[PDB]
Structures are given as C-alpha cells and as structure tokens.
Amino acid sequence: RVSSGRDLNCVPEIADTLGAVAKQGFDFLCMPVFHPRFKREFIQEPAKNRPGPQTRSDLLLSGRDWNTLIVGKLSPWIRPDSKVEKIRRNSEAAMLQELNFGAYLGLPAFLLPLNQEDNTNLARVLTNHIHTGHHSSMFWMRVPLVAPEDLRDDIIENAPTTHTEEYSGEEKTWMWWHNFRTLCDYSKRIAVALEIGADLPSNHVIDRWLGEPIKAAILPTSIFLTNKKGFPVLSKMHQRLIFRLLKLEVQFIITGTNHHSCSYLQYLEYLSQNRPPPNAYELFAKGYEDYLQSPLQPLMDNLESQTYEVFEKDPIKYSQYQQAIYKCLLDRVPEEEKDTNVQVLMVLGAGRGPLVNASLRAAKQADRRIKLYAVEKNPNAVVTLENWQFEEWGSQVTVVSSDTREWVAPEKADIIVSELLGSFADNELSPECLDGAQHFLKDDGVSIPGEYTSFLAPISSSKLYNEVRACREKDRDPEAQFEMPYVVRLHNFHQLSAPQPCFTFSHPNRDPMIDNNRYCTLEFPVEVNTVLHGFAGYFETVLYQDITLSIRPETHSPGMFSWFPILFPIKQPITVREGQTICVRFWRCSNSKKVWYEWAVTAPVCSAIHNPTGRSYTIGL
Amino acid sequence: CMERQLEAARYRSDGALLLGASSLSGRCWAGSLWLFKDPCAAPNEGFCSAGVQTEAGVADLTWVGERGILVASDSGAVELWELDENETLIVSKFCKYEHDDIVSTVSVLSSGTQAVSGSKDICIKVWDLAQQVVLSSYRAHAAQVTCVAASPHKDSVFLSCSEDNRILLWDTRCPKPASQIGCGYLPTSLAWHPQQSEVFVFGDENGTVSLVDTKSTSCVLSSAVHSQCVTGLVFSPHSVPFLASLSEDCSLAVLDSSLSELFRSQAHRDFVRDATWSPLNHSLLTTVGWDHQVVHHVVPT
Ligand SMILES: Cc1ncnc2c1ccn2[C@@H]1C[C@H](Oc2cc(C(F)F)c(F)c3c2CNCC3)[C@@H](O)[C@H]1O
Numbered sequence: 001r002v003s004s005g006r007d008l009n010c011v012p013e014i015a016d017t018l019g020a021v022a023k024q025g026f027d028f029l030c031m032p033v034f035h036p037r038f039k040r041e042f043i044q045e046p047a048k049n050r051p052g053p054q055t056r057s058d059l060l061l062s063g064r065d066w067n068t069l070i071v072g073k074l075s076p077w078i079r080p081d082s083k084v085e086k087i088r089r090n091s092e093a094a095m096l097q098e099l100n101f102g103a104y105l106g107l108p109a110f111l112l113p114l115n116q117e118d119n120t121n122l123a124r125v126l127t128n129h130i131h132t133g134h135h136s137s138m139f140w141m142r143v144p145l146v147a148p149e150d151l152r153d154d155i156i157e158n159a160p161t162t163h164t165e166e167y168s169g170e171e172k173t174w175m176w177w178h179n180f181r182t183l184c185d186y187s188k189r190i191a192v193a194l195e196i197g198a199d200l201p202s203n204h205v206i207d208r209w210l211g212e213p214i215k216a217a218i219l220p221t222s223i224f225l226t227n228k229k230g231f232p233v234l235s236k237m238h239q240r241l242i243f244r245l246l247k248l249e250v251q252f253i254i255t256g257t258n259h260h261s262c263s264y265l266q267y268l269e270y271l272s273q274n275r276p277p278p279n280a281y282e283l284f285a286k287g288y289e290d291y292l293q294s295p296l297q298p299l300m301d302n303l304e305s306q307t308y309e310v311f312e313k314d315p316i317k318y319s320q321y322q323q324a325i326y327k328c329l330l331d332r333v334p335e336e337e338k339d340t341n342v343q344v345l346m347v348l349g350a351g352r353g354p355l356v357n358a359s360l361r362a363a364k365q366a367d368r369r370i371k372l373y374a375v376e377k378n379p380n381a382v383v384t385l386e387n388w389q390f391e392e393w394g395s396q397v398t399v400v401s402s403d404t405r406e407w408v409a410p411e412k413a414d415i416i417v418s419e420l421l422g423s424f425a426d427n428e429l430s431p432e433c434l435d436g437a438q439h440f441l442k443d444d445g446v447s448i449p450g451e452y453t454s455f456l457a458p459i460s461s462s463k464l465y466n467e468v469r470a471c472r473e474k475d476r477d478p479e480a481q482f483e484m485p486y487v488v489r490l491h492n493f494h495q496l497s498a499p500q501p502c503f504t505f506s507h508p509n510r511d512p513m514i515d516n517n518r519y520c521t522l523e524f525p526v527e528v529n530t531v532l533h534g535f536a537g538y539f540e541t542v543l544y545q546d547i548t549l550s551i552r553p554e555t556h557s558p559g560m561f562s563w564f565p566i567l568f569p570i571k572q573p574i575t576v577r578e579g580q581t582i583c584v585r586f587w588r589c590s591n592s593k594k595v596w597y598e599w600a601v602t603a604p605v606c607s608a609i610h611n612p613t614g615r616s617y618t619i620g621l
Numbered sequence: 622c623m624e625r626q627l628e629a630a631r632y633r634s635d636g637a638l639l640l641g642a643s644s645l646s647g648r649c650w651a652g653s654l655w656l657f658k659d660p661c662a663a664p665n666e667g668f669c670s671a672g673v674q675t676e677a678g679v680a681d682l683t684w685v686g687e688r689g690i691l692v693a694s695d696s697g698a699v700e701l702w703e704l705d706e707n708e709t710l711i712v713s714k715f716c717k718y719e720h721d722d723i724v725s726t727v728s729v730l731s732s733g734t735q736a737v738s739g740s741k742d743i744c745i746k747v748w749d750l751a752q753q754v755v756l757s758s759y760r761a762h763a764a765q766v767t768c769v770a771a772s773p774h775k776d777s778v779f780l781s782c783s784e785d786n787r788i789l790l791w792d793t794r795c796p797k798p799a800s801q802i803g804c805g806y807l808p809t810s811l812a813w814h815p816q817q818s819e820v821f822v823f824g825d826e827n828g829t830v831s832l833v834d835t836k837s838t839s840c841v842l843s844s845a846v847h848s849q850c851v852t853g854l855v856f857s858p859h860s861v862p863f864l865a866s867l868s869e870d871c872s873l874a875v876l877d878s879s880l881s882e883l884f885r886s887q888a889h890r891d892f893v894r895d896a897t898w899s900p901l902n903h904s905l906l907t908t909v910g911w912d913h914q915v916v917h918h919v920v921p922t
Pocket residue numbers: 298299302303308311312348349350351352353354375376377378381402403404405419420421422428433562
C-alpha cells in the first residue's frame with residue numbers, strides 16, 4: 001500500500017544487498033552507481049590514468065532490475081560549485097560520467113543533493129546532461145525541510161545558534177530548490193526528494209513545499225521515537241505530515257542505520273491503513289487530480305451521450321433542484337387553488353431529461369398541477385427525450401427541439417428551470433441564454449436558478465504551471481496555453497488567499513441596457529512568501545430562496561460531482577512576499593458571435609493582459 | 622575478491638606494519654585488515670603474519686594499543702578488531718552501527734580507553750572502548766566530518782574539521798564543548814604537534830598546510846605544499862619532529878618546523894593515503910597508496 005525504498009551508502013555485493021532489501025519489503029534501492037569514496041581524477045597525471053575498471057558491471061543485474069529497482073545516487077565528493085577551480089572541473093567530468101552511466105543502465109531515477117545556497121554549476125551540468133542524448137530518467141533533488149546549519153546542537157561556545165525568529169531565513173531550503181529549478185528551466189524531469197528531520201520546522205516553512213513536484217519523502221531512522229513495546233513510531237506532528245504526503249502519493253525512503261529491534265516500513269503501512277476513508281467526491285476524482293481538461297461548451301457543441309450519463313448520476317444536485325421547484329410550487333399555488341391552477345413549467349436545456357424527472361417528483365410532493373416543456377437544441381439528446389415522451393411521460397411533457405433564443409413558445413411560462421452553468425458559473429453563456437428566454441416568461445414568472453456568482457482565489461502550484469506549459473501546440477501562438485481557462489480537479493496546489501466574488505448574474509433581469517460584460521478588481525491579502533501561477537475559479541448559485549448549490553470549497557455542496565474548479569493561468573509566475581497584496585483584474589467581454597474572459601495581475605507586479613480580444617480563447621454564442 | 626586500494630599504514634612500538642585496505646571498484650566493495658611483522662614483505666598477501674576480511678570498506682583505522690585495531694566502516698559502524706594471543710589472527714570484539722552514514726575518521730584518546738569517530742552523517746561520537754557504547758553524540762557541524770584528531774596528552778581535548786569550513790577545538794569539560802579556531806579553503810587534514818600541546822597543523826583542499834597555535838588565532842604561518850587536496854599529515858618520532866604531508870597530487874613531502882621542503886617523493890602513481898614513521902629507524906618513512914604500493918622512503922636528515 002506504500003511505495004517505499006531503502007537508501008544505502010554501502011553496497012558491498014549488489015545482488016546480496018538487493019535480496020536483503022526485498023526481504024525487508026522495499027520496492028526499490030537507492031545506492032551509489034560508483035564507490036562513494038573512489039575519487040577520480042580527469043585532468044592530471046598520474047591519477048588521471050588510473051587503471052582497472054571504474055565501477056562494478058551492468059551484467060550483475062537484469063535490465064528489468066536496473067529499470068525498476070535501482071535509484072542512482074551522485075557521489076558525495078562531486079562538488080561542481082566548489083571555490084577550488086580544480087574541484088569544479090573534476091566534479092563536472094565526474095558528474096556527467098555518473099549521470100551518463102545511470103542513463104546507460106536505464107535507471108528510473110537518480111539522486112542529486114541540494115545542501116548549499118549556490119548550485120549554479122550543478123544546475124548547468126544537469127541541464128547539459130538533459131540536453132545530451134536519449135535518457136528520460138527522473139532527477140531527484142534531495143533537499144531538507146531544515147538546513148543542517150540551522151538544526152545543529154547549540155554546543156559551539158563562540159558561535160551560538162540564534163534564538164530569534166527568522167521568517168524568510170527558516171524557508172531558505174525552499175529557495176535553494178526554487179533557484180535550482182528556475183536555472184534548469186522548470187524541467188518536468190526535475191523533482192523533489194524532501195528530507196524530514198527530527199524536529200519539524202514552523203508550519204509556514206512546511207507550507208512553502210505546497211504545489212511543488214514532490215516525488216519522494218526521505219525519513220531517516222533517527223526521526224523515529226521508540227514505543228513501550230520497543231518498535232519505532234513517529235510524533236503526532238510527524239504523522240500529520242506523513243498523511244499530507246500520502247495524499248500526494250510520494251515514494252517514502254528509509255535512510256540511515258538501524259536503531260530499533262521492516263519496523264519502520266510496518267509503521268508507515270499502519271499509518272497508511274488508518275487514514276480517513278475517501279468520500280464520494282474523493283473517490284470520483286481518483287485519476288482526475290491535476291489533469292487539465294477543456295471547459296465544456298454545450299451551447300457551441302453537442303454533448304456526447306456519456307457526458308449526459310455522468311451529469312445525470314449526481315443525486316445531490318437533482319435533489320436540490322427538486323426542492324427548489326417544490327418550494328416554488330407551494331409559493332405560487334395556495335392549497336385552495338390545488339386543482340384550479342396548472343403551472344407552465346419550462347426546462348431550458350433539458351438534455352436527456354433529468355430536470356424533467358425532477359419537476360415530476362416536485363409536482364408529486366408539492367401536490368400541484370404542472371404543464372411541462374422540455375426545450376433542447378442538441379438533436380441527439382432530443383432523440384432520448386422523444387423516446388421517453390412516448391414510452392413514459394406522455395401528454396404531460398411537450399418536447400421542443402430548438403434553441404431557447406429562437407423558440408416561439410405557445411404560451412408564457414410560470415417557471416423556467418435551467419442547468420446552463422459551468423465551473424465559473426457564467427462560462428457556458430447562461431446569462432445570454434436566459435436573457436433570450438425572458439420574453440416568453442410571464443411578467444411575474446420565477447427563474448431557477450435566480451442568481452449565480454463566480455469566485456476566484458490566487459494559487460501557487462509549480463506542478464500545474466508545468467502542466468499548462470506542456471500544452472504548447474504547433475500551428476498556434478507558442479504561449480496560447482496560458483490564455484485560456486482549464487477545468488481541473490486541483491490537488492497539488494496552495495490557495496494563497498480566501499476566494500472572493502468576481503461576477504454575479506440574476507434572472508430575470510427586468511432592467512433595459514442589461515449588459516452582460518463585466519470588469520472586476522480583486523485585492524487578495526497574502527500572509528505567506530510564495531510564487532503565484534494562476535487563479536482557481538469556483539461558483540455559487542441560488543436556485544430558489546435558501547436552496548443553493550456551490551463549488552466554493554468553504555461552502556461546497558457535499559457529495560456533488562457535476563463541477564470541478566476552473567484554472568486561469570498566467571504566463572510568467574509572480575513572486576509574492578509575506579504581507580503583499582495580489583491584485584487581479586477580470587473582464588467578461590463579447591461581440592454578437594463570441595464571449596470571453598480577459599485578465600491581468602496589477603500588484604505586486606504587472607502581468608500582460610491575458611487573452612486580449614479572445615485571441616487565444618472564446619466561448620461561442 | 623581483492624582490495625587493491627591501500628587506505629592505512631600504521632607501525633606499532635616494535636615495528637610491525639598495520640595495513641587497512643578497501644576495494645573501491647569491481648563486483649565487491651568490501652575491505653580487509655593486515656599485519657606484517659616483516660614490513661619489507663608488504664603488500665604481498667602471502668608474506669603476512671595475520672589477515673582478516675571485513676564486510677565493508679576501510680575508510681580509517683587506529684592502533685588501540687598493541688593488539689587492538691579500531692575501524693571506521695563505510696557501513697556506518699565503528700569496529701574493534703583485536704590480534705589473537707599468538708598474533709596470527711584478527712578477531713572482532715564489537716561492530717557497533719551507531720552512525721547513519723560512512724564512518725570516515727577515527728582517533729583513539731590519550732587513555733586508550735576512549736575514542737572519537739567522525740562520520741558523513743555530520744555527527745561526532747565519543748566511545749567507551751571497554752563498555753562498547755557511545756558516551757556522547759555531537760551534531761556540532763553542518764556538513765561531513767572530514768577529520769577528528771584526539772589530543773596527544775589530554776583525554777578530553779581533540780580537534781575536528783568539516784566541509785562546513787569549521788575547525789572545532791573540543792574540551793568535553795565545558796557545557797558547550799566546541800570552539801571555532803579560525804585564522805579560506807576547506808579543512809581536510811589535522812595533525813596535533815607532539816611537543817607543543819597547544820600547537821597543531823592543518824591541510825586544506827588547495828594543497829596548503831598551515832601552522833596554528835590555539836592561544837592566538839592570528840599571525841599563523843603557512844605554505845603551498847601540494848597542488849591538490851592534503852589528505853594527511855603525520856609528525857616524525859624525533860624529539861624535533863619533521864612533518865610528512867601526503868596528497869591527492871600523488872606526492873609526499875617532508876617539511877621542517879618552518880614548512881620548508883626537505884623531501885619530495887613521486888614514487889606513487891595513484892592517491893597517497895597514509896604515512897607512518899619507523900619506530901626503529903627514525904629516518905625510514907613508509908607510505909601506502911591507492912596503486913597497491915607500500916614504498917619505504919629514506920628521508921634525508
Ligand atoms: C441556447 C440553448 N438552447 C437550448 N438548449 C441549450 C442551449 C444551450 C445549451 N443547451 C443545453 C443545455 C444542456 O446542458 C446541461 C444539461 C445537463 C443534463 F442533461 F444532464 C447537465 F447536467 C449540465 C448541462 C450544462 N451545464 C453542466 C451540467 C445541454 O444539453 C445543452 O445542449
């Protein structure tokens with residue numbers, strides 16, 4: 001249940017060592033591809049001409065074992081940023097030699113350390129290896145939560161450890177990683193192997209690693225407390241961190257010598273088994289985590305049958321729609337008028353008919369009479385509606401195969417019910433649609449939903465930033481992927497500020513010079529040091545009175561699957577210091593043919609205006 | 622199968638040569654311990670008095686008296702290996718895995734009952750050789766412990782140095798035992814002076830050797846002996862001792878008290894790892910290397 005490995009620095013006999021590791025339970029071994037102490041010379045004689053083999057043979061293991069079980073480790077004497085010219089030159093050659101030997105073997109990962117502030121030449125030599133030949137291996141940057149210089153024993157008489165808070169100072173190992181991956185141009189092949197120490201740092205220090213590509217978590221044996229029975233266990237703070245990494249599905253690594261009567265692995269497995277079970281949303285999204293999808297355009301496109309199937313299997317959303325109609329039927333028809341008044345109920349964008357079936361159950365419990373209409377423009381869905389109109393609904397439902405803005409209705413409506421909302425509420429053009437249905441609505445008719453509001457929150461996620469970067473396509477603008485929203489089940493990210501309302505629409509809009517274009521300026525107070533990559537969009541809707549639906553994480557409608565958050569990226573990531581305010585501007589724009597968003601960051605620094613005139617993205621009318 | 626890389630050469634009181642070695646390449650990365658009652662018959666494996674195979678490479682070793690041998694293991698263990706009553710075998714006393722990485726430096730304290738190890742796990746541990754336990758565990762450094770050298774005559778004083786650029790003067794009598802002795806390049810080798818218990822020398826990774834007095838951390842005299850890192854420094858048994866410095870530049874130099882060069886030997890074709898002066902002939906100095914050589918030098922005095 002937990003992918004775990006063993007970190008070693010001493011491997012006298014490769015197959016013997018691997019067999020013991022596999023018996024222990026480790027799915028892989030991190031070991032040195034050359035002897036850790038076997039320092040080599042490449043420039044001066046006579047050590048340059050050192051005879052004999054340079055390392056053990058590739059023959060000692062099957063190609064499959066080298067591909068799935070061995071994780072390389074850079075030799076600890078290799079120091080490409082040494083202040084000694086000869087050590088840099090020598091460690092450059094030795095580093096390429098080790099990296100190339102790992103590529104020769106098809107190793108699935110290779111470890112490199114980040115133990116000092118300056119790793120510029122280390123980055124240049126890794127970047128040069130990445131650009132040479134054909135390999136595809138992952139590079140794991142072993143970086144600690146707390147630098148060894150800041151966790152030392154306070155035992156140097158003339159050099160004491162500081163006892164004052166250094167906010168940014170305590171997050172120094174994050175900057176070591178940030179500079180390193182900026183230098184290597186955000187390579188998808190460069191990830192973090194995070195080293196947890198005996199005493200965990202402040203929460204803000206830990207939170208600096210949110211949205212970061214963590215592929216492994218290194219637990220040294222010395223961080224384990226001993227229980228009454230004698231087996232290794234972890235503090236309740238260490239366990240909380242392990243639970244956070246289990247959500248990211250990192251590979252746990254056990255390093256260092258044995259100090260307990262694998263017991264370390266057994267504890268990890270025990271923790272893994274006792275984690276809270278995944279809820280309905282958590283089980284539905286399993287696989288969709290940080291996967292970028294295009295937002296649906298049901299108006300411009302015709303939805304596939306299986307898309308409607310998925311939208312139908314959301315009991316919570318339809319139960320909320322049932323009650324919204326149920327409360328409206330009671331409010332519109334008094335019990336004395338129970339069989340004198342039949343309400344004109346019109347579903348707009350009926351699909352295969354799930355709202356039609358909600359309006360039937362809402363007429364039964366409310367005990368009022370309704371005349372149903374199922375308006376749908378997708379002719380393929382309309383085939384499903386007409387087979388049900390004959391087989392089950394009957395004279396009750398009048399299926400109309402049209403676009404709501406071009407339909408000339410027989411009589412005016414009492415209630416119009418629609419589900420024309422996207423993850424950013426109005427992104428499927430619901431305002432435009434319901435506006436073109438207000439003419440066939442009675443001078444006192446109800447619209448369900450009656451209101452909806454979009455929300456935005458600034459996020460940090462170098463992983464989602466890298467995921468959007470990988471969306472570059474040929475025959476288009478090389479940066480167009482940063483000027484369009486994506487629907488995504490955001491997972492490895494950090495929300496830098498509370499969601500705030502962006503655009504609101506209310507139906508009906510009995511005001512002339514209505515105008516669905518918008519311009520909103522938001523100010524997001526940020527309490528942490530971070531890197532902004534985009535803005536998560538969510539929505540809230542008032543179906544009727546207190547009956548509401550929401551994807552705003554704080555007010556999220558429990559167990560609802562129909563919507564995932566949207567992501568509005570930005571071309572260039574923006575450094576945000578603790579106490580700074582991120583200021584974002586959003587626009588809803590349109591002409592007679594298309595509708596689109598435009599957006600820009602105005603503080604702490606300006607970005608370019610994203611998607612000017614829908615050049616990268618439009619929503620068709 | 623065999624250990625070509627000779628790591629340590631240590632002459633005891635009578636004149637029997639100690640030999641630590643590791644195979645830092647090939648199928649097996651294990652190590653070995655060897656005793657040669659006839660020093661001129663080294664490194665020939667069949668011309669030895671005793672030998673033993675270890676499960677891991679020998680990064681460092683020290684003579685715990687005349688029978689015992691303390692070993693710094695790659696496996697993360699401190700080991701005690703004692704000669705048998707006949708001196709034709711080497712047997713394990715303890716193999717304690719208390720360090721989380723390659724144990725690279727070892728030094729036995731004045732009383733011969735305590736010792737100090739320096740690992741790549743950044744810790745420094747003080748051991749009770751008889752009780753077979755770690756008396757104290759010290760995480761005073763920020764990077765790998767390169768070298769730990771116990772004081773000649775004080776059982777609670779010793780020098781350590783690390784890739785964190787610090788040289789710590791230790792005295793376990795204080796509540797904060799360590800103290801930085803400054804003056805540059807990373808410290809790589811430490812040598813206590815035999816007569817001045819307050820003077821010591823150290824070598825850096827730029828081939829420079831520096832003469833340091835604990836008292837005042839200023840005026841300090843130094844010289845560029847080597848072109849590459851200074852892996853070791855050993856003082857001669859003479860009443861006025863000569864200093865022999867070994868290096869990665871595959872050379873050995875013998876210097877006077879003013880750091881001037883009196884000898885230079887290029888007999889080695891690989892890294893020079895240890896030097897030991899003869900207890901019998903004080904102008905005879907033996908150097909083992911990574912090229913499997915044992916080279917016996919005649920220092921011009
Ligand atoms: C101008 C015009 N005139 C007539 N109909 C129109 C339009 C524009 C769109 N449409 C319909 C709307 C309908 O959209 C849905 C149906 C179901 C249900 F069927 F499952 C859903 F769950 C969801 C949606 C959309 N938001 C996510 C959830 C789709 O069928 C379109 O063809």
